[PDB]
Amino acid sequence: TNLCPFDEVFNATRFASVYAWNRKRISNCVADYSVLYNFAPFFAFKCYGVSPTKLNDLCFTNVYADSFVIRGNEVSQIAPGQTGNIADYNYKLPDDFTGCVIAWNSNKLDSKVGGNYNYLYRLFRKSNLKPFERDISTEIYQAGNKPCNGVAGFNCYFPLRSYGFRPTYGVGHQPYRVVVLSFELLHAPATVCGP
Amino acid sequence: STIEEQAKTFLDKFNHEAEDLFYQSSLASWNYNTNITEENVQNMNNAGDKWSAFLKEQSTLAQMYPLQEIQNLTVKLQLQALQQNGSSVLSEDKSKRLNTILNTMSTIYSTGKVCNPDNPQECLLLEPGLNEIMANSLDYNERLWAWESWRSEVGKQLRPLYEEYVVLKNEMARANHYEDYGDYWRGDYEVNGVDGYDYSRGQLIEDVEHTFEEIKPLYEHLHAYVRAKLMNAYPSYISPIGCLPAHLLGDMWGRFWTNLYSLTVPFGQKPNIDVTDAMVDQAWDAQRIFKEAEKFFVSVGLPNMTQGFWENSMLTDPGNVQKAVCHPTAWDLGKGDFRILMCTKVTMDDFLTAHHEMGHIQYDMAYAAQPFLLRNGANEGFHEAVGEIMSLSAATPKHLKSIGLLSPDFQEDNETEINFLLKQALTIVGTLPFTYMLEKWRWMVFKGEIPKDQWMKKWWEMKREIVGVVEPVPHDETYCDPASLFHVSNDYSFIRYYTRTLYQFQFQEALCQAAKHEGPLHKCDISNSTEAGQKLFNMLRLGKSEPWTLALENVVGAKNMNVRPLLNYFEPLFTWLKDQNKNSFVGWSTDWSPYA
Ligand SMILES: *[C@@H]1O[C@H](CO)[C@@H](O[C@@H]2O[C@H](CO)[C@@H](O[C@@H]3O[C@H](CO)[C@@H](O)[C@H](O)[C@@H]3O)[C@H](O)[C@H]2NC(C)=O)[C@H](O)[C@H]1NC(C)=O
Ligand SMILES: *[C@@H]1O[C@H](CO)[C@@H](O[C@@H]2O[C@H](CO)[C@@H](O)[C@H](O)[C@H]2NC(C)=O)[C@H](O)[C@H]1NC(C)=O
Ligand SMILES: *[C@@H]1O[C@H](CO)[C@@H](O[C@@H]2O[C@H](CO)[C@@H](O)[C@H](O)[C@H]2NC(C)=O)[C@H](O)[C@H]1NC(C)=O
Ligand SMILES: *[C@@H]1O[C@H](CO)[C@@H](O)[C@H](O)[C@H]1NC(C)=O
Ligand SMILES: *[C@@H]1O[C@H](CO)[C@@H](O)[C@H](O)[C@H]1NC(C)=O
Ligand SMILES: *[C@@H]1O[C@H](CO)[C@@H](O)[C@H](O)[C@H]1NC(C)=O
Ligand SMILES: [Zn+2]
């Protein structure tokens, strides 16, 4: 009984910025998905392609847990075929995404009275991300037709903007920690079951 | 890349940047208004300074995107507001000159004091000193002193500043390609590029004057009735055919005739509806007042207040040591943070104000999804109009009976309705000629239609002609009597109070029509009517995204400001006044003044 490290992904002290979203490969362990309930109301526990209801007796080749932080109104964008700043520029799921999206409010942790500017998001990008693509580049976005020369200015915007999470923010703007469990199925030994 | 998509990207940067910085400015301001310490002033100004400096930077960067090559008309609106803000239109000296003039005029108004005769020791400010006199004193000479003293020792101070204030404001508006500063103000109602919904700045003058002409019969009969009641109490001081003395109108300027109710109450034996006692009988606290106010908007299909509203607002006076600014205000800090600041007493007045201020919140929460630059009322009069129609429904006996604050044993007769409507007209109707005449005077001053040597001459000619109000002391051009009012000296447009009044009764009549309300409009409660709430929400969600002509249409089905619902509201009083003035002179003579 070699238990999967969902503790390190979900419970973690500080989540990644959504533009630099973390990814923790999970392999060769028993995946007790009933532990994945901290029971503190998970805003989202909506799974795609696979039923969450006691269907963990299924086995997968690899499990990818993508953890990041967004605000409440953007949790809707962690889903197939979704659009907006997060899905377009920060974290995109495929149309045929097979996996779970788990999100919960982290206002107690990721907000700060003076404003928590730790968590960033991508506001500008030349094109939408491919599914599961990550862009950590801080190159100044060129909106104009003049060269930016790596500094901010007119039509030259730093691509990343902070949430500035404050505890007094509304639910829509409050910080929400998100974990995206991706489930892989190759013609392969399928080394994650968790009976 | 085109010049429009560049501006779309620029607004994307601005909104995220502006919302964060605006929240810091708003929260620092909130902390000052709830916790008054010199640090909280310093923090509020520190975040306020960074906010205006942010806008000036972003306004200049917005001007680098020229408007004419942008078709989207929502990008064009947002940019137009951002570019318009930049006061770099004037030289930094003249900008600094004007700001000092604005600060000095504001300081002169707020700190201006007058000391009584034969005792230079006891001096009185406007608030609360002179306002208390003008609101409560029945003594002719005492009100005359406070009225004349305020204009002679504060208004005369403001006259040289207001003259230069006009020159610089006009210079600013002209280089903003407006005719004058009054033309700049009327631009708040301007709509362009929308077929069938456009609205010119000059159309506001035509519409205000046209709607005011239909008000004159209601005002003249109210003015005649008020004059007759005051003449009974002041036989030696008031002519039966002349204008009302300016110091006998219930406040410093006659802006509202509210405090003439005691001397003008049609049926003083009728006791007036006050549920303040019933609330104390039922041990209502401030949270109860807002919880019931919350329930009111839930009854029309509007969302209950956010959790952050209850945790973070201030609904009671903290009292003791911690000082607070007790002016009731609804705060939209952004980021979903909606707060109400109110030192709520357990009274009917605050109960109505809670509904009125929560009406502002409901407006704010409705257009929160709009872009930051469009997060506002459709025009300057929309937001306060939404608040007023909440107190209108909340104050009706039907609403008070349904919530246990008015016994079912109570039965409203035709006399208490007249008593109520008369009190409403003193505030609501009485302010309309005052509001129109004051803003007209400023419009003509900015236009240059009034020379400096004729300011007070014209000002009191219009007061006599339009408001039916006469100065009790002749006033030379050393006086600046308009500047003796807060809005004139503190550089606030005033026609918003005329348009908002008309909007609110257009709003109510449309909502009561949607609420299937049978009976006179003034008895209407929109409670439990999700049809009215959806009709109102259709405009509230728009914010500034769409023209106010269309936003008005989403409620009332009419594109333009109409005065008919206002006359519908006061019709039972209008028919009562005309009968009550059957052996009284209706109208006024401008040639009569209390100085022989
Ligand atoms: C003027 O510009 C605004 C944007 O500044 C336009 O509104 C935006 O229009 C786009 C489509 O052109 C919308 O994108 C779509 O959003 C829906 C809902 O999220 C989504 O299902 C689609 O896949 C697509 O992504 C966008 O949401 C909408 N709003 C904003 C705030 O961008 C507007 O249409 C323009 N008007 C004119 C007359 O050009
Ligand atoms: C994150 O940590 C908390 C504890 O800090 C975990 O919550 C416990 O979950 C177990 C399993 O059901 C319960 O028996 C305990 O009573 C829970 N304790 C508390 C304090 O909640 C939670 O499961 C962890 N999450 C993950 C994904 O590992
Ligand atoms: C309030 O209502 C009462 C009763 O309906 C009115 O009194 C009547 O007025 C009519 C005139 O139209 C007379 O013919 C009746 O004789 C009156 N009845 C009584 C019992 O006096 C009264 O005029 C109304 N007052 C107002 C201000 O509307
Ligand atoms: C008010 O501010 C002072 C200092 O600015 C602070 O020490 C105090 O805790 C504050 N109190 C409240 C109730 O906000
Ligand atoms: C009132 O607020 C609660 C918050 O938990 C919410 O569930 C509910 O939907 C809101 N409104 C109504 C009409 O239930
Ligand atoms: C609204 O509905 C509630 C619940 O049916 C009722 O108790 C209340 O009296 C109603 N109020 C009005 C003004 O219709
Ligand atoms: Zn208000």
Side-chain angles (χ1 to χ4, degrees):
Chain A
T1 55
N2 193 42
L3 303 101
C4 288
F6 293 111
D7 189 353
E8 328 171 349
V9 153
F10 284 81
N11 256 264
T13 291
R14 160 183 285 97
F15 272 47
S17 305
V18 77
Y19 89 96
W21 46 275
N22 225 66
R23 170 157 273 196
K24 174 55 155 323
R25 193 225 191 110
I26 294 207
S27 307
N28 308 116
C29 53
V30 289
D32 193 3
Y33 294 104
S34 290
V35 186
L36 272 68
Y37 302 81
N38 78 341
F39 307 106
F42 277 144
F43 185 178
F45 213 144
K46 205 284 174 273
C47 305
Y48 308 79
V50 44
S51 290
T53 46
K54 276 208 186 70
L55 192 70
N56 80 46
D57 44 80
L58 196 55
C59 301
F60 310 85
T61 312
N62 295 275
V63 173
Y64 299 110
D66 304 323
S67 79
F68 49 78
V69 154
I70 40 182
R71 57 139 154 142
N73 280 162
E74 319 201 279
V75 160
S76 74
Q77 304 183 43
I78 320 292
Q82 228 71 34
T83 166
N85 270 348
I86 294 328
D88 303 341
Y89 299 163
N90 295 268
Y91 184 85
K92 180 74 200 190
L93 291 153
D95 292 358
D96 58 352
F97 164 66
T98 294
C100 296
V101 169
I102 303 98
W104 64 99
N105 181 278
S106 58
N107 202 37
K108 203 86 189 297
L109 296 142
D110 295 320
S111 286
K112 184 197 316 184
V113 159
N116 181 29
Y117 294 94
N118 163 50
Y119 297 98
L120 301 191
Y121 58 90
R122 190 160 299 276
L123 184 49
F124 315 110
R125 222 185 147 250
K126 295 206 226 243
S127 65
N128 292 9
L129 305 153
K130 296 158 235 323
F132 294 134
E133 192 198 330
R134 187 199 300 117
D135 190 338
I136 71 163
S137 114
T138 89
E139 209 218 14
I140 306 295
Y141 175 86
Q142 174 176 233
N145 314 327
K146 274 191 244 303
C148 278
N149 307 324
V151 79
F154 177 55
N155 288 310
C156 286
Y157 313 134
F158 184 71
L160 308 181
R161 249 4 92 98
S162 180
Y163 287 103
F165 286 130
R166 312 179 156 80
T168 48
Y169 278 12
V171 167
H173 290 256
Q174 259 163 56
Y176 276 81
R177 289 184 171 184
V178 175
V179 180
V180 188
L181 295 160
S182 324
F183 296 117
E184 244 178 17
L185 227 39
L186 302 157
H187 313 129
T191 73
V192 189
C193 295
Chain B
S1 93
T2 182
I3 180 85
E4 159 164 318
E5 281 157 333
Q6 284 179 19
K8 269 171 182 162
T9 306
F10 168 68
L11 290 168
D12 227 335
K13 184 207 82 192
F14 169 83
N15 293 338
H16 296 244
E17 235 146 314
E19 289 184 38
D20 178 66
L21 285 128
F22 179 82
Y23 195 102
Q24 314 194 48
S25 176
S26 296
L27 192 39
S29 324
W30 167 274
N31 290 336
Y32 170 85
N33 287 246
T34 63
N35 188 6
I36 293 193
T37 89
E38 188 68 16
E39 142 193 37
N40 270 346
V41 210
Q42 286 269 324
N43 277 117
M44 161 182 202
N45 294 105
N46 279 327
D49 286 351
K50 298 162 139 192
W51 169 241
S52 354
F54 166 80
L55 279 175
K56 190 179 75 192
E57 171 142 8
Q58 298 294 321
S59 179
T60 305
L61 304 161
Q63 282 147 237
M64 290 161 111
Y65 304 92
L67 256 205
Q68 52 240 54
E69 321 101 319
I70 290 189
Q71 302 96 299
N72 175 271
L73 216 43
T74 310
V75 180
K76 182 157 179 156
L77 220 32
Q78 295 177 239
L79 277 164
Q80 190 247 325
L82 245 180
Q83 310 178 163
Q84 170 123 345
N85 195 275
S87 193
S88 206
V89 49
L90 270 192
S91 78
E92 56 146 10
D93 179 66
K94 288 183 171 170
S95 146
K96 255 141 64 176
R97 276 211 285 157
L98 175 62
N99 272 243
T100 299
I101 291 170
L102 295 176
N103 292 338
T104 312
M105 288 205 306
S106 184
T107 322
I108 284 176
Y109 184 89
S110 39
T111 76
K113 47 148 208 61
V114 66
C115 323
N116 77 47
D118 62 88
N119 184 302
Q121 281 287 274
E122 168 183 319
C123 306
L124 276 181
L125 290 170
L126 178 71
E127 179 66 36
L130 289 199
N131 280 332
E132 199 277 321
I133 288 169
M134 299 306 288
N136 300 113
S137 172
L138 300 147
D139 174 79
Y140 183 97
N141 286 330
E142 169 170 24
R143 311 173 57 80
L144 171 55
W145 165 79
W147 188 97
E148 169 62 31
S149 276
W150 178 249
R151 278 152 193 80
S152 97
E153 296 168 50
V154 194
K156 291 193 187 200
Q157 286 189 64
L158 299 153
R159 179 52 183 263
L161 300 173
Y162 206 77
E163 292 174 351
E164 217 182 347
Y165 156 91
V166 166
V167 198
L168 291 175
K169 285 293 191 173
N170 278 332
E171 279 176 5
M172 169 251 256
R174 270 121 196 199
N176 282 121
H177 313 96
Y178 291 86
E179 302 172 2
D180 47 73
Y181 192 44
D183 194 23
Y184 174 102
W185 270 346
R186 303 190 289 276
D188 187 83
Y189 305 91
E190 182 163 28
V191 172
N192 297 108
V194 166
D195 323 317
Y197 290 107
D198 281 354
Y199 197 92
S200 66
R201 309 192 284 266
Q203 186 68 19
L204 176 69
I205 314 176
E206 322 182 29
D207 275 321
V208 163
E209 311 172 319
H210 186 277
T211 50
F212 183 65
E213 289 275 5
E214 323 199 39
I215 271 161
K216 296 186 179 186
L218 174 57
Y219 179 65
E220 292 187 346
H221 282 282
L222 167 69
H223 177 281
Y225 170 71
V226 164
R227 178 179 52 201
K229 301 287 287 184
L230 292 186
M231 184 198 25
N232 290 347
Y234 303 97
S236 49
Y237 293 116
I238 285 158
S239 158
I241 66 142
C243 295
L244 291 183
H247 66 294
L248 297 178
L249 297 170
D251 59 28
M252 178 54 74
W253 322 262
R255 179 183 180 204
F256 303 107
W257 297 4
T258 324
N259 302 330
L260 308 184
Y261 181 69
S262 58
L263 286 180
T264 61
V265 46
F267 310 105
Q269 317 269 25
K270 304 282 135 159
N272 161 0
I273 289 192
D274 203 335
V275 303
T276 298
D277 278 357
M279 280 146 82
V280 190
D281 295 330
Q282 304 162 32
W284 277 31
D285 40 5
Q287 189 222 123
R288 179 46 176 301
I289 290 178
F290 291 88
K291 278 308 186 162
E292 218 80 1
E294 178 184 56
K295 180 180 324 196
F296 164 77
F297 300 96
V298 195
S299 80
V300 291
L302 293 174
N304 45 18
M305 300 282 100
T306 67
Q307 173 218 265
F309 174 89
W310 298 110
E311 291 163 339
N312 306 313
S313 299
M314 206 185 49
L315 312 177
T316 52
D317 197 322
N320 296 330
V321 176
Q322 186 198 345
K323 294 151 177 155
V325 170
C326 277
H327 184 13
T329 36
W331 292 65
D332 176 24
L333 304 84
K335 303 318 210 133
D337 188 4
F338 307 104
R339 320 223 189 139
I340 275 187
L341 209 179
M342 193 180 331
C343 306
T344 319
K345 326 293 158 155
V346 190
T347 81
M348 182 174 153
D349 282 337
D350 292 14
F351 171 86
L352 301 186
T353 306
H355 291 63
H356 165 104
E357 291 294 337
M358 192 174 279
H360 291 302
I361 295 306
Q362 291 288 353
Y363 209 171
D364 302 333
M365 321 185 23
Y367 54 70
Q370 294 280 359
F372 176 86
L373 289 164
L374 305 169
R375 270 181 226 159
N376 220 332
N379 63 50
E380 53 184 26
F382 263 68
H383 226 296
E384 221 64 36
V386 172
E388 294 296 335
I389 75 181
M390 291 336 162
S391 43
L392 292 180
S393 306
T396 54
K398 177 215 288 164
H399 188 82
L400 299 169
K401 293 203 174 151
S402 73
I403 65 172
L405 287 192
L406 205 42
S407 181
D409 299 329
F410 191 106
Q411 197 73 44
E412 49 240 47
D413 62 336
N414 51 339
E415 272 182 6
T416 54
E417 318 275 29
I418 280 308
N419 264 5
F420 168 82
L421 283 169
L422 188 269
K423 187 168 195 171
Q424 293 284 92
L426 293 170
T427 306
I428 299 170
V429 177
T431 203
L432 297 169
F434 173 97
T435 299
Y436 159 63
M437 174 264 134
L438 180 139
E439 198 81 318
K440 176 133 205 64
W441 180 91
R442 296 206 287 186
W443 287 344
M444 308 180 33
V445 156
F446 299 143
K447 274 189 218 282
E449 296 176 350
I450 309 171
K452 260 135 64 144
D453 79 305
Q454 259 165 108
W455 270 15
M456 282 327 110
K457 194 221 156 113
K458 232 278 172 173
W459 168 268
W460 285 110
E461 279 183 343
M462 317 179 48
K463 281 277 195 200
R464 293 163 187 239
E465 176 216 342
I466 302 177
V467 206
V469 170
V470 58
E471 73 278 32
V473 166
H475 274 195
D476 49 43
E477 305 305 320
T478 74
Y479 293 97
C480 196
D481 294 344
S484 75
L485 179 62
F486 170 86
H487 305 69
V488 177
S489 42
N490 283 257
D491 191 48
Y492 285 109
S493 85
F494 211 68
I495 203 60
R496 80 227 290 159
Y497 301 101
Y498 179 91
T499 59
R500 169 230 89 188
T501 288
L502 271 66
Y503 293 158
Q504 88 195 31
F505 294 109
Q506 293 180 259
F507 288 167
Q508 258 275 107
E509 199 193 65
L511 297 191
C512 308
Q513 219 162 129
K516 306 173 190 289
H517 167 77
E518 289 135 64
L521 174 61
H522 82 267
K523 307 214 230 224
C524 156
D525 181 16
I526 67 175
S527 298
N528 288 351
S529 166
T530 40
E531 319 257 47
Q534 180 73 35
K535 185 161 245 262
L536 172 70
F537 185 83
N538 280 11
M539 182 267 313
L540 301 180
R541 57 161 307 271
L542 277 194
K544 253 160 102 156
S545 70
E546 231 67 64
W548 72 267
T549 49
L550 163 46
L552 192 67
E553 205 180 49
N554 294 22
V555 216
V556 317
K559 304 163 147 103
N560 198 1
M561 166 189 36
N562 194 13
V563 79
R564 205 210 20 82
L566 162 66
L567 307 176
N568 181 20
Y569 186 91
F570 288 103
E571 202 197 321
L573 182 77
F574 186 49
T575 54
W576 180 89
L577 291 173
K578 293 191 289 176
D579 174 55
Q580 272 282 321
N581 310 321
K582 67 180 176 285
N583 46 261
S584 328
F585 182 85
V586 178
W588 50 85
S589 174
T590 78
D591 83 308
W592 180 94
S593 32
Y595 49 101

